[PDB]
């Protein structure tokens, strides 16, 4: 199960939509991602060698920028399908498979990711709500990482 | 059951707001006492913790003033459930105020919580134990960060 | 046009009730007050270095204000019970003891709180001859 | 049993139910309709207040007074001091009428109906019966009601 | 006749309701009464010996507190039935009888009472209106005191 | 006392209160919330039906069944024949659970609250208590309830 | 008839507000004069009271200015009828301003009042004499507290 | 950008009209002004000891403000009639004669009144180059 | 008679009636419909302004002008100086048309209808007839209208 | 609680967006700011003698404010493009060169602008720890 209260969900939605809607700016989406990873790395540089395939060597490279975006799209997909519990399932399942296959990704690599989004979302979000976010995020961070 | 949901907080907020008396200390003290009286009954050595505020003479000014302060604190958190970011700071403060008192155990809260659960339904109108519990415990969790057990 | 009499207290009690609203707008109520306080005494901020007194728009400070207005609510609510009131006022006094709160500081906060209350309930009806004196009873209590 | 909490509660609910203005008249009218339907014989008791015409100012005036008593008494549940004295007063007013205390039971029933009926499913039946009795006892020193 | 304008009445209502509704506090009702009498006495101490029956000896006594409340209840009954002119009649008639029988109560004892409420209501009431109040109050102060 | 008229009446009101569709679920949820607030200890009695989660299908299912019982019984008040047999049946279902009959009193209270709270000031308190008892008696042969 | 009721004040307020000119002194003076002219006609020795403001030359600047001041005063009270508490203070002030002039009798007002009653209907639209009177007299009563008679 | 010309007068006349409303909000209009006056010159309150200058939220003071704005209305209304205007201005002058109103005091009140007017009619439209000078014409008249 | 008060009043009401914008056109159209129904023969008088088509710009333009005259004159009632001069001007404009002054009476009637009809029962009939005449007199020095 | 980081910039960008509205209320947004500026530093008006700094309620001044907020919009919009941003900041600097803008002057304007922004978007949500530092980046640039 990848759900949280119908309302705890609507909150996250508004907030996420607030910083990442289809109508933002190519530059904003990039920075959110850039920051997310830069932070995800300073926390555990032992993880950099995990994105070698996507020019992680140069975070500002197209290859990597492209990767980052793919991640955002995903988080969006999730956050947004938070109201449709059964679909979010497939959502997760998929992402899970996509990660279980990447040799090296740990079920705690995600724990780190979480801490990062949590420590930096309030920087960009308006009336950020850690509770609603923790309630919905851990719900799916747990589903995506169903291996290792 | 699970966690204090948004819906839950709204509920928690009403159950409380309705028995709350904004102009006088009457009901506050009445409720506060009903709770402590029940806490002290199910946990003998508990009373020994409120020596500084005459926890023996529950009708003493020292203790009444205390109840007032307690009920106020809980009001602070309950209302702050709508703004978790700030609640966190507030509960952290309450936490510190309690880390400073030897004898205050995480399990002590676990108890006072049951008490509230026994009291509220008596004074509150259409009480929702489950919802209340979920959110009460959310407030507890924060207040009791480093306390023993 | 002073003396926080039993009737003035009842009045302040009810007006406080309206201002301290239901349990939502308290964030803005707090903000207004403290905002006003520092607009008058920018220096006063230095006393709140522990709670982000530099930016009241902070969960840290918002939480502070929460505690303040909360204390204030108790006093106003205890206004009719002289004995318990002073017991509490005493407690508040000890909470300020060390801190160097000057008399003029309380005057400012008191003024601000009234502004805050008036702001919400309106100038038409706002018993100043009741708030003014009754607030002092509280202040002079914390005074020590 | 009528605990201090039960009282704070009974007051709370009474307040909500008794209403503010025109609602009070309505409530009163509802209450008494019930009283006389629950015990149609108890009507003759109030002919002194023109119970013949339940809409007569004479009777509405009565309703007004009894409700006022009910209010001032309930509201004082958190003050034995006054409560007892005022209840004692009411006893003085009712003793000479030699009323069968059973009627006060009918009342309790009717009151419950009217208050719960107006207040909602939240109505605390036990708390009401308990505290209602503290008043009935005080007015007509009987069983416990 | 115990009436005043339909509107002049509505005003008094709101104001009275403002300080004495079934949903106030046992403590507030007491103080309004306490003050009303304390003031009613300082004005004419020659009246104290009129409430000897209700422990007026000790204003804070239950017996007296009980009395005071009975008075409030009454004023309430009146103020509120101000819209129903014919019922307020019976209201008055009754109170009248209840007072005409108390040997000592003067048709001016009430005049004093009035002056008291008037000088002290604005202390507790919000946007107090002496006019509306005088117009409705004198209407019934006059009906209650229909003897002596 | 529970006269034939009182029964026709109790049915009439139950009908209005129990409602038609979604109203029934609501009523049931209201009734049980009251039951467990009136006697918080009686909750542990229903752990067999997951009373832990008052919104669990397991429990809603329970509520459904008990309300259905309540309905089929009340509706049969005007037919001693069936009423007795069905009440007897229910007794068979409850006897082995060894339940303190006092709980059935709590129920009566809670039912009154819920029904009156939903039905309105017209609620006939005495008629309900009387006929409710005919049922309680039949289910747990006790005092008269 | 009886007393200046709330309903009455609302009416009073409109009858006045409609003939009032917020931007110029024209109508004010026109009305003021119509009143005084009528007062002076029904009360001979009255004119002798406005010597300080040339009550003889009703078209004199001194008197026009006076009219302006009078009409203003009445506006003050009429509008203040909605706030009796403050009206009382205002009327008391006007009262004092009149106690200070020898010759100003309570009966003088009684007269000017009749005058207004004769004038208003001529300039005001749908005039209500009764209501106007009730409230006019309420304002009078206050203005004339200690004045003789 | 001054000179209270005939046109500026017409303008002030109309804008005053809007601010001095219909006959209700005058309480708040007065409050705003006087409130602002004392916010700038807290000392000025000492001149109004007779009319509760300590608490403008008083029937006594409210009544005072009533008189003030009322006078002001007359002057603004007389603005087009130079002769009668000065006659009135003269009267107002005598009403202040003894009292120690300094020039800076009128500057404050004038400012406040404009603030009050702007507050009501809006910044978009508020002829300052008309109010400023025309108000002075009135002030300088009372000046003596 | 047309007192200074009556004038302040006539203006006040004219203002309310004549309206602000589209209301004016409406009023004008109403006024003239009345004029020509009250005296159908007076229509031929305005053929110079295409009175054939009462909706023709030619005529609406006329209506516009006469109303404008009516306004500028009424508004000047509190200033004999200008009033007389302007009325005199209007006389110069009408004298050469040799119009039977009786028509100006028809107008007065029609105006009263139109203004009262638009203004309301508050309409001061005498004040209007009086002051209307001051204008009619000035435009066609006759009886008093 | 400073450092105009990339995230703080994004924040300021969005909040500025809301305050600088759609293209209407800009007149009032400008008025508020500049109004506040002169309420703090009445003297500052002397620097704007060319654009009616004596009456901000003037097409002349309104036009001025338009230019200012406009410049400000560019800087905030360039915040993410360091290189182009400084190029612009440079341009702005030269536009002030002669004029005697003291550091304290910028502090005031900066404060005012934030007040303006808060006024529109609300105290609940108004990242002060972002505006404060980011605004300085712009100011310190124009500084020279
Ligand atoms: C909640 C945050 C996360 C989401 C929603 C997410 C999403 C994605 C998506 C959509 C892809 C690319 C799918 C594709 O191949 O088409 C991906 C790839 C990947 N993710 Fe995640 N991911 C998250 C967290 C993490 C974390 C914490 C790590 C470990 C530090 C991680 C490591 C990887 C790696 C190594 C790849 C493969 C990159 C490549 O193709 O070379 N992900 N992720
Ligand atoms: C689990 C049982 C609890 C224990 C054993 C405990 C114990 C204490 C003690 C002994 C004090 C010190 C009193 C003094 O010396 O002044 C205290 C203070 C306080 N407690 Fe607790 N507490 C408990 C639960 C709570 C809860 C749930 C709340 C309310 C949400 C609360 C609110 C407060 C507050 C506001 C203070 C006063 C701080 C001050 O003003 O100095 N406590 N508590
Ligand atoms: C008149 C109303 C006032 C009330 C009711 C009040 C109440 C409080 C309360 C309850 C606390 C928190 C104590 C704790 O839980 O540790 C507090 C803290 C404080 N108060 Fe007051 N206070 C008032 C006025 C003032 C004034 C006039 C000042 C200074 C201008 C002031 C300065 C402080 C400071 C510095 C703190 C400590 C902040 C911290 O926790 O770091 N208070 N006050
Ligand atoms: C707790 C419930 C009751 C309250 C609070 C109450 C209160 C009152 C009050 C305030 C009065 C009028 C006092 C006066 O004379 O000024 C009154 C009158 C009376 N009451 Fe009760 N009463 C209650 C129940 C009953 C019941 C159950 C009966 C009879 C079935 C009853 C019979 C009477 C009668 C006959 C009068 C006389 C009215 C008259 O003729 O003037 N009361 N009651
Ligand atoms: C408008 C205000 C007043 C109201 C509505 C009022 C109401 C009442 C009521 C309800 C009672 C008790 C009825 C009962 O015996 O059950 C009462 C009793 C009494 N009232 Fe009044 N009253 C008013 C003014 C006064 C005044 C001005 C006096 C004279 C100072 C007065 C003297 C008394 C006395 C002596 C009693 C008898 C007390 C006793 O039982 O020993 N009342 N009044
Ligand atoms: C007149 C009121 C009542 C009615 C009509 C009633 C009816 C029913 C019905 C229909 C069932 C389920 C039958 C089945 O197993 O298919 C049931 C089950 C049960 N009832 Fe009652 N009941 C009543 C009151 C109570 C009370 C007061 C208690 C205890 C406080 C109680 C305890 C139980 C228990 C424990 C079950 C077992 C459910 C399970 O575990 O499956 N009932 N009742
Ligand atoms: C009954 C007839 C009245 C008489 C005999 C009377 C007489 C006077 C006189 C002689 C003055 C002094 C003028 C001077 O020397 O400056 C005066 C001033 C005044 N009167 Fe009256 N008055 C009457 C009615 C009223 C009424 C009804 C109002 C309006 C409600 C009114 C409003 C004023 C005002 C505002 C002043 C000017 C005070 C000042 O600015 O100094 N008067 N009156
Ligand atoms: C510019 C507009 C002003 C106007 C039109 C004006 C008008 C008035 C009027 C009509 C009165 C009442 C006179 C009476 O009825 O006795 C008055 C009183 C007074 N004015 Fe002014 N005034 C103005 C400015 C000022 C200023 C600048 C000050 C002081 C800062 C001031 C101080 C006073 C005082 C002290 C009183 C006497 C209060 C009392 O009655 O005790 N006025 N003014
Ligand atoms: C008091 C009412 C009247 C007013 C204020 C008035 C005003 C005017 C005005 C302003 C004009 C046009 C001036 C111009 O040529 O620029 C005009 C034209 C005229 N009026 Fe009147 N008028 C009034 C009544 C009448 C009446 C009663 C008649 C005839 C029954 C009349 C017949 C005419 C005619 C024939 C024209 C000539 C239009 C043309 O051919 O251009 N008027 N009037
Ligand atoms: C921090 C934000 C600021 C920005 C973005 C800014 C922007 C501008 C711009 C674009 C112009 C117009 C240049 C032109 O087109 O010729 C201007 C003019 C001016 N600025 Fe600034 N400015 C700022 C702060 C300040 C401050 C702090 C002051 C003074 C307290 C100031 C004083 C001036 C003056 C005196 C002018 C010239 C007015 C004129 O054209 O006569 N500026 N500013
Ligand atoms: Zn201030
Ligand atoms: Zn104020
Ligand atoms: Zn200012
Ligand atoms: Zn401005
Ligand atoms: Zn500022
Ligand atoms: Zn702020």
Swiss-Prot record, chains C, H, J:
UniProt GO MF annotations: heme binding; iron ion binding; oxygen binding; oxygen carrier activity
Residue ranges annotated for the Globin domain, each copy included: 3-144
Cellular component annotations (GO), alphabetically ordered: extracellular region; hemoglobin complex
Signal peptide residues on this chain, from the entry's feature table: none
Main location as per UniProt: secreted
UniProt keyword annotations, A-Z: Heme, Iron, Metal-binding, Oxygen transport, Secreted, Transport
Domain of life: Eukaryota
Binding site for heme b: 96
Pfam families referenced in this protein's UniProt entry, alphabetically: Globin
Family of the protein in this entry: Belongs to the globin family.
Name of the protein in its database record: Giant hemoglobins B chain
Organism (species): Riftia pachyptila (Vent tube worm)
């Amino acid at each position: 199960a990848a759900n949280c209260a119908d309302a705890a969900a609507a909150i996250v939605q508004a907030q996420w939509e607030d910083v990442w809607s289809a109508a933002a700016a190519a530059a904003s989406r990039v920075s959110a991602g850039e920051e997310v990873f830069a932070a995800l790395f300073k926390m555990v540089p032992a993880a950099k060698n995990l994105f070698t395939r996507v020019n992680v060597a140069d975070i500002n490279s197209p290859e990597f920028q492209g990767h980052v975006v793919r991640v955002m799209g995903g988080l969006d997909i999730l956050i947004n399908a938070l109201d449709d519990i059964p679909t979010l399932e497939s959502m997760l399942d998929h992402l899970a498979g996509q990660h279980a296959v990447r040799d090296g990704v740990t079920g705690a690599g995600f724990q780190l990711m979480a801490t990062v989004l949590m420590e930096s979302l309030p920087q960009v979000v308006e009336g950020f709500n850690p509770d609603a976010w923790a309630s919905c995020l851990a719900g799916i961070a747990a589903a995506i990482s169903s291996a290792l | 059951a699970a966690s204090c949901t948004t819906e839950d907080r709204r509920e928690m907020q009403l159950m409380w707001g309705n028995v709350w008396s904004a102009q006088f200390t009457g009901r506050r003290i009445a409720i506060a006492q009903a709770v402590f009286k029940d806490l002290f009954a199910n946990v003998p050595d508990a009373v020994g913790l409120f020596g500084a505020v005459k926890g023996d003479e529950v009708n003493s000014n020292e203790f009444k003033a205390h109840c007032i302060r307690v009920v106020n604190g809980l009001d602070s958190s309950i209302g702050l459930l709508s703004d978790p970011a700030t609640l966190n700071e507030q509960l952290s403060h309450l936490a510190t105020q309690h880390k400073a008192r030897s004898g205050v155990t995480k399990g002590g809260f676990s108890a006072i919580a049951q008490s509230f659960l026994r009291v509220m339904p008596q004074v509150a109108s259409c009480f929702n134990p489950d919802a209340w519990s979920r959110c009460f415990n959310r407030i507890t969790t924060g207040m009791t960060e480093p306390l023993p057990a | 046009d002073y003396v926080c009499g039993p009737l003035q207290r009842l009045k302040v009690k009810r007006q406080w009730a309206e201002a301290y609203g239901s349990g939502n707008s308290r964030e803005e109520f707090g903000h207004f007050i403290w905002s006003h306080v520092f607009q008058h005494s920018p220096a006063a901020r230095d006393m709140f270095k522990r709670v982000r007194g530099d930016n009241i728009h902070t969960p840290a400070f918002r939480a502070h204000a929460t505690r303040v207005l909360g204390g204030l609510d108790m006093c106003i609510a205890l206004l009719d019970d002289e004995p318990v009131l002073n017991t509490q006022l005493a407690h508040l006094a000890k909470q300020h003891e060390t801190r160097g709160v000057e008399a003029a500081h309380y005057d400012t906060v008191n003024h601000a709180v009234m502004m805050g209350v008036e702001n919400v309930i309106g100038s038409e009806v706002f018993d100043q001859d009741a708030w003014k004196p009754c607030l002092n009873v509280i202040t002079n209590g914390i005074q020590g | 049993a009528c605990a201090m909490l039960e009282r704070a509660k009974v007051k709370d609910e009474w307040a909500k139910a008794y209403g503010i203005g025109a609602a009070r008249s309505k409530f009163g009218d509802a209450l008494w309709r019930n009283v006389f339907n629950y015990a149609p014989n108890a009507r003759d008791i109030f002919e002194s207040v023109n119970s013949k015409d339940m809409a007569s100012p004479e009777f509405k005036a009565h309703i007004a007074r009894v409700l006022g008593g009910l209010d001032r008494v309930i509201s004082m549940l958190d003050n034995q001091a006054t409560l007892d004295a005022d209840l004692a007063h009411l006893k003085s007013q009712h003793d000479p009428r030699t009323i069968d205390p059973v009627n006060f039971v009918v009342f309790r029933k009717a009151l419950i109906a009217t208050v719960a009926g107006t207040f909602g499913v939240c109505f605390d039946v036990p708390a009401w019966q308990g505290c209602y009795n503290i008043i009935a006892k005080g007015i007509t020193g009987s069983d416990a009601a």
